[PDB]
Amino acid sequence: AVAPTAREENVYMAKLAEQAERYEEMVEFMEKVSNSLGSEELTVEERNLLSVAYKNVIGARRASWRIISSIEQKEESRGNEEHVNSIREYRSKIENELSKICDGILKLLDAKLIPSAASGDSKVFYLKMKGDYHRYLAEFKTGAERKEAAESTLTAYKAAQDIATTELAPTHPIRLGLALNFSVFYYEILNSPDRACNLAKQAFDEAIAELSYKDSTLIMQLLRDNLTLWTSDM
Amino acid sequence: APTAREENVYMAKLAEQAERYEEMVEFMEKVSNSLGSEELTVEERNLLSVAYKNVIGARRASWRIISSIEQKEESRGNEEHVNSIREYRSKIENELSKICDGILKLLDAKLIPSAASGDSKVFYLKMKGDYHRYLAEFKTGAERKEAAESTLTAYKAAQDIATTELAPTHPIRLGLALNFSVFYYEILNSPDRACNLAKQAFDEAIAELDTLGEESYKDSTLIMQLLRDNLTLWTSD
Amino acid sequence: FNELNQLAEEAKRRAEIARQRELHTLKGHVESVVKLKGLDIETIQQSYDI
Amino acid sequence: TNFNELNQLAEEAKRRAEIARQRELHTLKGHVESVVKLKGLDIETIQQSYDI
Ligand SMILES: C=CC(C)(C)OC[C@H]1O[C@H](O[C@@H]2C3=C([C@H](C)COC(C)=O)C[C@H](O)[C@]3(C)/C=C3/[C@@H](COC)CC[C@H]3[C@@H](C)[C@H]2O)[C@H](O)[C@@H](OC(C)=O)[C@@H]1O
Numbered sequence: 001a002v003a004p005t006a007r008e009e010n011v012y013m014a015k016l017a018e019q020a021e022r023y024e025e026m027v028e029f030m031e032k033v034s035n036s037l038g039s040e041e042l043t044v045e046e047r048n049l050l051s052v053a054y055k056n057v058i059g060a061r062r063a064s065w066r067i068i069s070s071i072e073q074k075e076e077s078r079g080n081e082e083h084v085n086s087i088r089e090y091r092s093k094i095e096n097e098l099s100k101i102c103d104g105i106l107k108l109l110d111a112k113l114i115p116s117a118a119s120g121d122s123k124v125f126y127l128k129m130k131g132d133y134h135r136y137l138a139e140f141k142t143g144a145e146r147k148e149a150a151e152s153t154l155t156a157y158k159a160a161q162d163i164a165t166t167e168l169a170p171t172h173p174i175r176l177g178l179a180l181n182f183s184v185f186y187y188e189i190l191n192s193p194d195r196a197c198n199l200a201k202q203a204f205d206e207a208i209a210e211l212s213y214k215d216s217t218l219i220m221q222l223l224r225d226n227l228t229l230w231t232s233d234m
Numbered sequence: 235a236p237t238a239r240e241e242n243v244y245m246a247k248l249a250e251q252a253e254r255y256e257e258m259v260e261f262m263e264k265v266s267n268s269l270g271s272e273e274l275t276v277e278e279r280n281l282l283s284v285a286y287k288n289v290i291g292a293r294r295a296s297w298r299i300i301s302s303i304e305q306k307e308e309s310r311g312n313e314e315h316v317n318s319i320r321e322y323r324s325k326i327e328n329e330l331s332k333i334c335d336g337i338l339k340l341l342d343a344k345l346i347p348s349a350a351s352g353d354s355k356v357f358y359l360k361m362k363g364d365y366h367r368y369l370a371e372f373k374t375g376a377e378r379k380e381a382a383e384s385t386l387t388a389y390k391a392a393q394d395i396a397t398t399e400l401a402p403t404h405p406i407r408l409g410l411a412l413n414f415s416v417f418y419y420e421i422l423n424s425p426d427r428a429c430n431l432a433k434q435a436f437d438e439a440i441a442e443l444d445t446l447g448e449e450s451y452k453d454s455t456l457i458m459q460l461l462r463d464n465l466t467l468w469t470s471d
Numbered sequence: 472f473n474e475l476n477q478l479a480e481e482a483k484r485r486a487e488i489a490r491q492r493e494l495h496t497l498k499g500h501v502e503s504v505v506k507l508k509g510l511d512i513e514t515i516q517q518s519y520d521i
Numbered sequence: 522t523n524f525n526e527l528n529q530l531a532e533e534a535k536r537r538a539e540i541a542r543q544r545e546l547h548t549l550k551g552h553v554e555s556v557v558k559l560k561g562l563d564i565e566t567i568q569q570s571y572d573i
């Protein structure tokens with residue numbers, strides 16, 4: 001049997017891991033794929049797998065964090081100081097993991113993924129990633145640590161948008177996905193809902209004006225969903 | 235000023251809701267090591283079982299997904315992928331081993347011995363068959379024989395005690411009936427023993443609807459319909 | 472309106488049956504995952520355990 | 522109650538189910554909301570937007 005190369009076995013194992021809900025392994029596998037490439041470009045499929053792997057791994061911690069915060073809100077209501085401190089002790093351990101994960105991918109993005117990026121596409125992809133993980137930090141960091149994080153997010157999304165907006169069609173899944181997240185950053189991190197509605201609505205409008213499909217249409221549905229949520233809430 | 239036990243139990247409940255089940259196990263294990271002659275309360279009991287159920291459940295899920303893929307690939311002649319998938323099934327099989335064994339030795343050293351009432355004893359006997367059953371699901375040949383033997387021994391014990399000491403409507407009794415019947419179906423491949431066992435446990439529960447209980451009733455009611463679900467599927471061949 | 476709400480109620484109840492199976496059984500959980508992910512995979516032989 | 526009408530209601534519910542599936546699969550908010558539904562968590566709705 002001809003031994004599979006490191007690249008091909010670990011791309012396949014990432015795909016098994018994803019189907020199997022073994023997302024920490026999926027990261028392990030995609031990092032092995034990344035090492036077999038040095039600073040050469042990942043394919044579309046390879047980078048999508050890598051993004052999905054970190055998306056899920058951090059997602060799980062984002063979800064845990066949101067749930068625990070709601071339990072803590074209810075308990076701040078019900079005046080249960082003892083429970084509130086336990087939840088707080090615990091939300092912390094969660095925040096350490098989020099930190100650690102974020103630092104991991106951010107380091108890979110700065111050292112390998114972003115300078116590898118040839119086409120605008122790929123450059124938008126990676127700078128979006130870099131925006132997102134700084135945003136995830138911003139979600140829970142306090143005053144100065146938040147500002148640093150918000151600062152790093154803006155500068156990545158602004159750099160992505162300046163490429164996407166001039167190099168990619170309004171209908172491009174990555175332009176679309178960037179506007180989604182950039183708009184969210186404004187709504188949730190900066191708390192500027194007018195700025196958020198403006199950006200989201202513009203990306204949606206430019207895209208609508210231009211009418212492959214499947215991913216674009218999903219992200220456009222999400223833009224619309226967000227816009228309708230943010231308005232009924234004004 | 236809450237105790238270290240009380241604190242860990244609250245911690246377990248947080249972890250369950252956050253879906254952080256490995257930590258849930260950790261917290262529940264730190265509880266069952268600190269206890270002496272006392273057995274665990276009903277709540278603690280449940281927290282523990284759920285934690286191991288979920289930690290292990292994630293892997294059983296993984297195992298079945300992967301197996302399904304192996305069969306789609308094997309019927310395509312992708313030797314190459316069938317290797318990777320087998321390599322990977324094996325890595326999971328390992329995890330199932332180590333988890334099953336952590337809990338199985340706890341059951342044997344602490345939890346089972348300290349079980350004083352029927353309730354308590356059935357609850358752990360059931361758990362003992364359960365994790366032997368998880369081994370049987372993926373083990374092969376010799377090791378599977380042992381697993382299957384161990385399973386039958388532990389369930390059959392639990393059932394005699396349940397049949398004499400627990401109400402037929404009692405969720406612990408019903409739960410056993412459910413898993414024991416699954417055991418015969420999925421591991422022993424005896425659909426008639428599976429159905430006979432299930433239908434019986436179901437029918438005794440119905441014969442005694444007088445004994446559904448203020449808190450008991452939703453749990454026992456769910457399990458009853460799970461037995462009916464299995465039966466319904468097993469009967470239609 | 473009349474037949475439609477009776478329609479939704481039946482749906483809601485079946486949802487509730489699905490929800491319990493997904494929460495407390497391996498089968499339910501596996502099935503959700505296969506549906507959610509849209510895995511093109513042969514139906515697995517499963518029974519309910521707790 | 523008319524077939525064509527029932528058939529269309531089925532198609533519309535199926536179209537929306539399919540979007541609901543993609544949200545739950547691909548978004549933090551979809552995922553989080555389903556986890557609270559599944560568990561039946563006694564918590565008050567978490568404020569969330571969709572990100573990808
Ligand atoms: C599961 C397998 C993997 C490899 C992960 O693929 C997931 C998905 O990968 C691609 O889709 C991307 C993509 C997603 C799509 C929106 C999913 O589309 C549908 C219809 O389900 C969600 C993913 O996270 C992914 C990979 C990520 C991004 C995101 C990246 O930020 C750095 C920005 C937008 C979006 C882009 C890259 C999408 O093109 C494909 O276009 C999708 O398939 C098609 C053609 O419909 C496939 O479902």
Ligand SMILES: C=CC(C)(C)OC[C@H]1O[C@H](O[C@@H]2C3=C([C@H](C)COC(C)=O)C[C@H](O)[C@]3(C)/C=C3/[C@@H](COC)CC[C@H]3[C@@H](C)[C@H]2O)[C@H](O)[C@@H](OC(C)=O)[C@@H]1O
Pocket residue numbers: 250280281283284287357358360361405406409410449452453454456457495521
């Ligand atoms: C998951 C949430 C936590 C907090 C852990 O509670 C688990 C659950 O714990 C109790 O229910 C038990 C129980 C389960 C019930 C059948 C769930 O029923 C309903 C309607 O919620 C499933 C669980 O795995 C658990 C704890 C386990 C067993 C199992 C033990 O084998 C060793 C065999 C029978 C079954 C018994 C012990 C059930 O009584 C409770 O009575 C349930 O509350 C309700 C609705 O009645 C609660 O959701």
